[PDB]
Amino acid sequence: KVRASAAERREYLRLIASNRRALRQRDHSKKHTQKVHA
Amino acid sequence: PQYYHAHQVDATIQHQKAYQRQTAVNENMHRSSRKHVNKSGHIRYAKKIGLGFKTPAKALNGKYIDRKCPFTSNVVIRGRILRGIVHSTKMHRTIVIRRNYLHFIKKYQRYQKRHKSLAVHCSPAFDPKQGDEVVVGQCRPLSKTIRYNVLEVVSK
Amino acid sequence: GIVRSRLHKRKITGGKTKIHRKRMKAELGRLPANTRLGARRVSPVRARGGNFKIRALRLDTGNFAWASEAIAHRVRLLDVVYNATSNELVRTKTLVKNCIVAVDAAPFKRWYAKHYGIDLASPKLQREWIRRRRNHRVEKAIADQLREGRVLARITSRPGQSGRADGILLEGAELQFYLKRLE
Amino acid sequence: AKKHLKRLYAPKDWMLSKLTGVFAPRPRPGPHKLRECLPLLVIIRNRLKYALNAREGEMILRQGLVHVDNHPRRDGKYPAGFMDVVEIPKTGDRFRLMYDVKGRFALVSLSEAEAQIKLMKVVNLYTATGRVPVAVTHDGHRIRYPDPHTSIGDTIVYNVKEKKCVDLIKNRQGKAVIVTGGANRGRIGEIVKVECHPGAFNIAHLKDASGAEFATRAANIFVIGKDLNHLQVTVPKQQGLRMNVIQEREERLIAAEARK
RNA sequence: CAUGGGAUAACAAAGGAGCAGUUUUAAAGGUCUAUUGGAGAUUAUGGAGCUG
RNA sequence: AUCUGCGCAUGGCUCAUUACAUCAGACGUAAUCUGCCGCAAAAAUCUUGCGGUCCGCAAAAUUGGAUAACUUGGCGAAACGCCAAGCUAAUACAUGAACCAACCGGGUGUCUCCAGAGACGCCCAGCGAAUGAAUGACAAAACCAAUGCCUGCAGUAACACCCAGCAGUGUUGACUCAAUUCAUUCCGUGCGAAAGCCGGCCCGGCGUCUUUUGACGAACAACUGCCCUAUCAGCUGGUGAUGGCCGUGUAGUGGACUGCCAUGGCGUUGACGGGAGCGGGGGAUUAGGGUUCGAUUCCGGAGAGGGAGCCUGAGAAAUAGCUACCACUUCUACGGAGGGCAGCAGGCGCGCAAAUUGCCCAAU
Numbered sequence A: 001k002v003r004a005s006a007a008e009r010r011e012y013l014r015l016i017a018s019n020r021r022a023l024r025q026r027d028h029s030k031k032h033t034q035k036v037h038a
Numbered sequence B: 001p002q003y004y005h006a007h008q009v010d011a012t013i014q015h016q017k018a019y020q021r022q023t024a025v026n027e028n029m030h031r032s033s034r035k036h037v038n039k040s041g042h043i044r045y046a047k048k049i050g051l052g053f054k055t056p057a058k059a060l061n062g063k064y065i066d067r068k069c070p071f072t073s074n075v076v077i078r079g080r081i082l083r084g085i086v087h088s089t090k091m092h093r094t095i096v097i098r099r100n101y102l103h104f105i106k107k108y109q110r111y112q113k114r115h116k117s118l119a120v121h122c123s124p125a126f127d128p129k130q131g132d133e134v135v136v137g138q139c140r141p142l143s144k145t146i147r148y149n150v151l152e153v154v155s156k
Numbered sequence C: 001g002i003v004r005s006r007l008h009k010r011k012i013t014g015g016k017t018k019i020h021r022k023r024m025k026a027e028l029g030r031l032p033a034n035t036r037l038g039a040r041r042v043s044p045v046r047a048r049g050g051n052f053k054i055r056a057l058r059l060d061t062g063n064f065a066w067a068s069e070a071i072a073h074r075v076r077l078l079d080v081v082y083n084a085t086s087n088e089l090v091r092t093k094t095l096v097k098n099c100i101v102a103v104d105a106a107p108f109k110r111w112y113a114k115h116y117g118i119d120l121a122s123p124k125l126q127r128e129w130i131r132r133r134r135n136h137r138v139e140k141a142i143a144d145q146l147r148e149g150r151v152l153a154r155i156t157s158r159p160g161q162s163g164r165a166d167g168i169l170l171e172g173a174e175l176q177f178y179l180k181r182l183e
Numbered sequence D: 001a002k003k004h005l006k007r008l009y010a011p012k013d014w015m016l017s018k019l020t021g022v023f024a025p026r027p028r029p030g031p032h033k034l035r036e037c038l039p040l041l042v043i044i045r046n047r048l049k050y051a052l053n054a055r056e057g058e059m060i061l062r063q064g065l066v067h068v069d070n071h072p073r074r075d076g077k078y079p080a081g082f083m084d085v086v087e088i089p090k091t092g093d094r095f096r097l098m099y100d101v102k103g104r105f106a107l108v109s110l111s112e113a114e115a116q117i118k119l120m121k122v123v124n125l126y127t128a129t130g131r132v133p134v135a136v137t138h139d140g141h142r143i144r145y146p147d148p149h150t151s152i153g154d155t156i157v158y159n160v161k162e163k164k165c166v167d168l169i170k171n172r173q174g175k176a177v178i179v180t181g182g183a184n185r186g187r188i189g190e191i192v193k194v195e196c197h198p199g200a201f202n203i204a205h206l207k208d209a210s211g212a213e214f215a216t217r218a219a220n221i222f223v224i225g226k227d228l229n230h231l232q233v234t235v236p237k238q239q240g241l242r243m244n245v246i247q248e249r250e251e252r253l254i255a256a257e258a259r260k
Numbered sequence E: 001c002a003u004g005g006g007a008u009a010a011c012a013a014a015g016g017a018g019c020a021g022u023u024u025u026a027a028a029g030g031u032c033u034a035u036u037g038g039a040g041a042u043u044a045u046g047g048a049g050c051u052g
Numbered sequence F: 001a002u003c004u005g006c007g008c009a010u011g012g013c014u015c016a017u018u019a020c021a022u023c024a025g026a027c028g029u030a031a032u033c034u035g036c037c038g039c040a041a042a043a044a045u046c047u048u049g050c051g052g053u054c055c056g057c058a059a060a061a062u063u064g065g066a067u068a069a070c071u072u073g074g075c076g077a078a079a080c081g082c083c084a085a086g087c088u089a090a091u092a093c094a095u096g097a098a099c100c101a102a103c104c105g106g107g108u109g110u111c112u113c114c115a116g117a118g119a120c121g122c123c124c125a126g127c128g129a130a131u132g133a134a135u136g137a138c139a140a141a142a143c144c145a146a147u148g149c150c151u152g153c154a155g156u157a158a159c160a161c162c163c164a165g166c167a168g169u170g171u172u173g174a175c176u177c178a179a180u181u182c183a184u185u186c187c188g189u190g191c192g193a194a195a196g197c198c199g200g201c202c203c204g205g206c207g208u209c210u211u212u213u214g215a216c217g218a219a220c221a222a223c224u225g226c227c228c229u230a231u232c233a234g235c236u237g238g239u240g241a242u243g244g245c246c247g248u249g250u251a252g253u254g255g256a257c258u259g260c261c262a263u264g265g266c267g268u269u270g271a272c273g274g275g276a277g278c279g280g281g282g283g284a285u286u287a288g289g290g291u292u293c294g295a296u297u298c299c300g301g302a303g304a305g306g307g308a309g310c311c312u313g314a315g316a317a318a319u320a321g322c323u324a325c326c327a328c329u330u331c332u333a334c335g336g337a338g339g340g341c342a343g344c345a346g347g348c349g350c351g352c353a354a355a356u357u358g359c360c361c362a363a364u
């Protein structure tokens, strides 16, 4: 139950760190798709 | 090059047989971060209390060392927020406010002038004269009679 | 016993308060510790909740911190130098919070030779000393009493409450405050 | 340390008659508040008539036959309160504690799929040791890794069998609540406007299905769905609609005359 | 505690010499953040404000 | 029968005290303690066995000493009094778990590399606690050094491999808080997997340390309110009265308290002192305005013959707990030993004035 509780941290940390990744790569798209335009 | 040249003693605030310092932050940091340092020079602890009260110009850019102060200490303002008028400022760093109210008598269909006086701790951010209207906020006991602490002064 | 109530205090009108209950246990106070210098002897006190509050009698050592360097070292208290409450507490050498003491200064010099490499040569491989030491400089009033042998320091813990004599080294204007009052 | 209740100082929603004994079963600390629960001796004896007295009532409970939120409760003084799910495997009935529109506790009958989830309102959020952010709930639960969009006023759907927070309901303008305190307790309404007033009590303005406008403190509202049609949990038979006192008085006389 | 209505009254301050020019335009002198791939250290130009 | 674990701090009685007190409505605790109960958490600890004298091979850790009851001998007029010896338990007391079994971090010495990078080695790295430091957000180009991708700069999370997104993001109206990083060290005043108990035919019911928070509470603070009295006009302040500075003490805030400094604070809007006596919910009467009563069932406060002071416990300044004195007081074999009905029945007094030394846990 310490391994299972340290497993449910490692997948809460992929819920947090993926949501931060999806915001990195919607902004570096929307910056680069207007940098092409000008 | 090895020597640091620390700050000299500011004798205008240092009167009180122990060194007057703020417990929140250390005055003696060499490369103190931009967290607590104010505009001109020195390290200072200033806090934002709750209910839409703007901290004064002093308590950010002042030099005074106050404990029991709502803006520069661990004193938290909570509970009641009241108003009074300044009655006497004769005590050191403490004022007595006067709260004047009309007490309605249900039998004689008429009001009655009563008053309550409260000892209120007054920060050196503020200099209220007699008759000035203040806003006080409740805090912990700070003395035998001090429960409130001045938040804003409305002049004259 | 000793109580902490306002039942015995006069009203602000000057009137006497007439007492209509016995003393409560929930309003007690206890006799002071009067912690002095000496070899360590402590007596625990059973507080509320069953918690233990360790009275310090006779303390000689503590962890003192050098806050610019963000380190601490277990050093030995030498003397009690200045107390803001009374000069009589200096003479009986009571340890309270905020009293000014002198400490050993030997672990601080040894740390300042091990870290920054300045004495008051052997690892030629690791000169991460050079990665530090350039921006940082040391106050002169510290380095004088550091090599003089004892450093003035300030007690930052409450010994009668915690049974510890932890502290901080006086720096800056705070050292220059207390050096004037002594000499 | 109080250990007794007088039956007059007991809550009125329990509906214990004043002439039957001096004392009422004081609910222990636990999940729900003493003022805001219905202890299991009152459910097994006074609500359901499975027990004629308190002596028959502990023959049921101490034997392990009543389950509050999937776990057998052998305490007659266990505080069961709002959104709890009370199962009984032998009689095959399972109920949910809801407030009806007159403010009293009501036992809403459930299916098997509707009896697995309960809806729980966050009361506090903090970080525990480690860096684990846990969520404190009105039922006393401490969910350790909730949905990261959890704020304090929200509602977590929980599924008490597999202890996994399956869903989240934020507290916003467009949601529907149930009122769990005050004069308006048991009423269901859409949220209209939430008046903040920092330092004091948040006031929440609410509009009912009929259009009746009413307000409460926002610590009294309990959001239970996205709208008044898409409620996440089933509600009692009035469905939060408070009829007029004149119209509901006429209908009982009409129903009693038409019955004879 | 929240909120809106502004009749009547109230607190406060004043005692009227005891008093509180707005914009376009180019010019002079002088004061203590954002970009150049990052971060560190120097460095002139410039924005907006300073006054004659 | 006795060890052990909880309980006896509730309930019940009474209303003597008591006017910046209690109490009511309403707030505060970010100034704090909190057993039982609810949902959770948990990677610290070189221990055993066998062989050899500190090492080797092993592994379901087959741990240690003492007391009751009891027996024996008893002391004493007695006492809800006692002694000595001999036995024996644990979920009492004490001791103690390597490897299975992680991630992550700091400080640091040899070794393969390049003109700083890696491998290895050592010390330290658990929850809680102390002190110190760091987080706990924010609201146009030019040149040199180190460094990033390009074949001069297109475009870009951060990071020298192990994991190319394994936290760049706690909460509040507000925190010096929640939590995390590192520095030092906790010497009993913390941390077992009870070295625990059952049950089913590996699994399931319990029972327990620590840690943490909801809940039931505790303690403090005070916004508005309160009978009569001036044949009571000044009250407080050396020996704390109002405030300020270091401390101390507390569970915590604080003249609560030591030291020092200042000269305040309250009052004809009735202070101060005296008399009446628990405070509300409420009762009686009332067109309206009122005038009265509230010892009494519910809530709160206080007390247990008066007055203290304590122990134990999560909680008592407890009284069907202890210690002492004062006033009464019972047994004695005179050596001594005890008492506490404002619990329920009763008893004597006192008065105008108030019942049964009853049956039962069937209900609450």
Ligand SMILES: NC[C@@H]1O[C@H](O[C@H]2[C@@H](O)[C@H](O[C@@H]3[C@@H](O)[C@H](N)C[C@H](N)[C@H]3O[C@H]3O[C@H](CO)[C@@H](O)[C@H](O)[C@H]3N)O[C@@H]2CO)[C@H](N)[C@@H](O)[C@@H]1O
Pocket: C008, F239
């Ligand atoms: N007045 C109460 C306070 O007493 C304090 O001082 C008091 C003490 O110095 C002293 O009180 C002592 C006390 O220390 C000691 N531990 C116990 C003793 N019973 C008390 O004595 C006091 O009480 C008894 C009975 O009332 C009287 O007989 C005695 O004369 C009186 N001095 O006497 C003073 C009271 O008269 C402070 N002066 C002050 O805080 C305040 O006056």
Ligand SMILES: [Mg+2]
Pocket: none
């Ligand atoms: Mg026992």
Ligand SMILES: [Mg+2]
Pocket: none
């Ligand atoms: Mg009365």
Ligand SMILES: [Mg+2]
Pocket: none
């Ligand atoms: Mg203080």
Ligand SMILES: [Mg+2]
Pocket: none
């Ligand atoms: Mg009572």
Ligand SMILES: [Mg+2]
Pocket: F306, F326
């Ligand atoms: Mg007497």
Ligand SMILES: [Mg+2]
Pocket: F341
């Ligand atoms: Mg009787």
